[PDB]
Amino acid sequence: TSILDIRQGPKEPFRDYVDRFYKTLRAEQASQEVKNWMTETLLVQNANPDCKTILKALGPGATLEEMMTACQGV
Amino acid sequence: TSILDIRQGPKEPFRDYVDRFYKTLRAEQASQEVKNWMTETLLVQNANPDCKTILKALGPGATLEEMMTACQGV
Amino acid sequence: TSILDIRQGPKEPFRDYVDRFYKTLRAEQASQEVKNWMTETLLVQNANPDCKTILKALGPGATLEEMMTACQGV
Amino acid sequence: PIVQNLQGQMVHQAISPRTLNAWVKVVEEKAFSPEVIPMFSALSEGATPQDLNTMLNTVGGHQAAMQMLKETINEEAAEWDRLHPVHAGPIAPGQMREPRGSDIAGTTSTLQEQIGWMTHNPPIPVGEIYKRWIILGLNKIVRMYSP
Amino acid sequence: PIVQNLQGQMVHQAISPRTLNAWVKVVEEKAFSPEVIPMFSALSEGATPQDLNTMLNTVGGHQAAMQMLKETINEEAAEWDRLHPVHAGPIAPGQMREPRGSDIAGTTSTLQEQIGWMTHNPPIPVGEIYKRWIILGLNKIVRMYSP
Amino acid sequence: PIVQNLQGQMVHQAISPRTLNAWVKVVEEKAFSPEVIPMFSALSEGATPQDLNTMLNTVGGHQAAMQMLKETINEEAAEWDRLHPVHAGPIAPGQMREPRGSDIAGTTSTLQEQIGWMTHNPPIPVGEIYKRWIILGLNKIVRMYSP
């Protein structure tokens, strides 16, 4: 399965999705800079509308514990 | 079972067939040159029409990762 | 069970019978020459008519891989 | 493998059965998963080419992958021979011969020869060259066997 | 087997029960499968003829194959005797006797004799000669037992 | 058992629990099957009479066979005493006593006595004499317990 095919379900907790992401990211062998680009970009983009909304409110500069606690009720 | 009796099913993934081939090839003890001849020849010949068609389009010079990714949807 | 009581069924593969024979032969403690005599003699004698027929066509001088491949379809 | 003895020299010692079986069990359980590569790397510590063919030859199953790896090992070996040409003139009596791709793959070399190269001064890391080919070929497999 | 001791000499040590049992378990699980041959080869490292008959005699089941192997071992042994004739005149007091097919098969030789031949200088590899016969006979079996 | 120590002497060491348990497990699984005899033979390498009674006494089940064996061991022992008469006159201060059937069976001898006989020069193989009686009695059992 390709990294672009990794997406969050409509009922799937973000948490279970983030695990899937760094597992597939774990099978990507690209430069770190590209993998940083993938992190800030693709993760949020394939996140579900309800959490996506939430993550837009965190702004930039956000870290994984704060994202992970931010989308917990969703 | 003989190597000539190894053939791909009409619904069987190529992949499962290629595994069967190098297992039976693993029980053949012939010179390497003969076993090379068997590789390029018999594998494609007993491959199913849908994949067979696919493999004809790869042309010669093809390697196993490219054959294996080529017949994946079939 | 005695070695004379070892016989091939009417539907039993020879192979399964030959296994039984060298297991029981494995519990006989007689001189090697006697055990050679038992091998060429008793094995064929208690073999079923269909395979027995087959084994008669191999003639003498025959070895176990050739007997075992000879009575395979029977 | 080639290990250091108490006396302070490098000597060959055989690999252990529950090490062997641990290699088997990893492959049984985690197949093509990435954790196989660090795992391999740890269990290949101080290992010979000969021991590395032993580990590859003792696999059961996944024969399409095993063939892809073989063919990668030979390609990487062909590439070793290409990049490193044979050296000028006859081999010196005082010296031992330079390896080829097939000596690195363990095929054309004997154990005592594999111990000569590694234990000698300077030492040559023919394990680590095969190890990269194995890891490289492991990447090929992992990338393919991703679904 | 005959192993090297800490002191730096080759001495005999017995084979281990969980080694024995690992040999048993391989045969139980993988029967005639090809992985049995590298497996055998690893577990036969430094092994005597005597230990090799022990391993063959401790099999249960697959008696048709066990008989085919025996008969291959004797054929290969008959062939050893044919190819290598006995040597000229009486045996020297200063020397030890050349092996026959049956000494290689372990049958006519004693352990101390098997240790004499292997530990002595030059050493003779009577294990490796039996090993090829076993591997050859293993090919015969594998080829037959293919379906 | 009596094993060789690093220093280069023969000393007694105890047999291991997973060796003991492996003896138990063989008997559990393969009962009277012939593979039991090579198996026994390997696990009895360097063993004392005392250790051999330990192995026989630790059996559970198959008590008809265990009694038949006992009675074979005593018959073979009675036969030892018959064939080898006691020697002329009193025992020398400088020497140690010749064994009887019951010393071979371990019954009338102590461990230190069993170590005296085996470690002394010439050594006497009281293990191997009991071993044949065990193997002989094993044949009796195997032949009977064939169906």
Short mmCIF file of all heavy atoms in Angstrom, two decimals, chain D residues 91-97, unseen atoms left out:
data_model
loop_
_atom_site.label_atom_id
_atom_site.label_comp_id
_atom_site.label_asym_id
_atom_site.label_seq_id
_atom_site.Cartn_x
_atom_site.Cartn_y
_atom_site.Cartn_z
N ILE D 91 50.25 -13.18 -8.11
CA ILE D 91 50.01 -13.04 -6.70
C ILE D 91 51.31 -13.27 -5.92
O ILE D 91 52.04 -14.23 -6.17
N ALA D 92 51.70 -12.37 -4.98
CA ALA D 92 53.00 -12.52 -4.21
C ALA D 92 53.09 -13.72 -3.27
O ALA D 92 52.07 -13.96 -2.69
N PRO D 93 54.13 -14.46 -3.07
CA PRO D 93 54.17 -15.56 -2.09
C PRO D 93 53.91 -15.14 -0.66
O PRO D 93 53.32 -15.93 0.10
N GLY D 94 54.33 -13.93 -0.35
CA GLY D 94 54.23 -13.27 0.93
C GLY D 94 52.84 -12.75 1.22
O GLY D 94 52.53 -12.26 2.28
N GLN D 95 51.90 -12.84 0.28
CA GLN D 95 50.60 -12.20 0.41
C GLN D 95 49.50 -13.14 -0.01
O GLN D 95 49.68 -14.24 -0.52
N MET D 96 48.31 -12.71 0.31
CA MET D 96 47.15 -13.51 0.04
C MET D 96 46.30 -12.63 -0.98
O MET D 96 46.57 -11.46 -1.20
N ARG D 97 45.47 -13.36 -1.70
CA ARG D 97 44.88 -12.90 -2.92
C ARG D 97 43.73 -11.88 -2.60
O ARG D 97 42.97 -11.94 -1.64
#
